[PDB]
Design a binder for this molecule. Structure first.
Ligand code: DO3
Ligand code: DO3
Ligand code: CL
Ligand code: CL
Ligand code: CL
Ligand code: GD
Ligand code: NA
Length: 128
């Protein structure tokens, strides 16, 4: 699924992501735009042999199982394939663990370089 801006904000907000660990709802919609282009099916291969999956590009090294990342952890206890669903539940519960882990939203390289220190509220502007 390719999400609209307002449509993804309302879904993230219903899954409780809004002000989670003090990160406003604009920081999250920001990250998804630059990580996936709002596309739940996005995949990207990393040079170490791990792969990032879904709208927040969650990495197979620590967070889920794709059966081809040797001696890696599955700390979300999910197949990576589940992070590719039109239903963003899996991706959101899995991001709640990552953003809590000590480094906050810096785990997302596109958030650090394109959203951190910007007017993030602009990303939910106009939505009901
Ligand atoms: C809502 C309209 O903006 C729709 N829009 C009309 C064309 N716009 C004109 C403009 O943005 O005033 C210029 C192109 N636009 C550049 C950008 O927005 O950064 C990329 C395409 N956009 C992507 C999006 O906006 O989500 C969809 C088409
Ligand atoms: C021509 C405009 O499209 C210029 N635009 C600024 C105004 N936009 C317009 C809008 O989308 O209605 C609203 C804010 N915008 C939200 C979003 O677009 O996703 C984030 C910033 N954008 C990023 C981008 O466009 O890729 C910068 C360029
Ligand atoms: Cl915001
Ligand atoms: Cl594996
Ligand atoms: Cl933090
Ligand atoms: Gd924009
Ligand atoms: Na793994």
């Amino acid at each position: 699924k390719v999400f609209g801006r307002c449509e993804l904000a309302a879904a993230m907000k219903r899954h409780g992501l809004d002000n989670y660990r003090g990160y406003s709802l604009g920081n999250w919609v920001c990250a998804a735009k630059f990580e996936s282009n709002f596309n739940t099916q996005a995949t990207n291969r990393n040079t170490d042999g791990s792969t990032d999956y879904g709208i927040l590009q969650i990495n197979s090294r620590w967070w889920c199982n794709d059966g081809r990342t040797p001696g890696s952890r599955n700390l979300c206890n999910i197949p990576c394939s589940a992070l590719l669903s039109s239903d963003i539940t899996a991706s959101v519960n899995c991001a709640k663990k990552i953003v809590s882990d000590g480094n906050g939203m810096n785990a997302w390289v596109a958030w650090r370089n394109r959203c951190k220190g910007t007017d993030v509220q602009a990303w939910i502007r106009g939505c009901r």
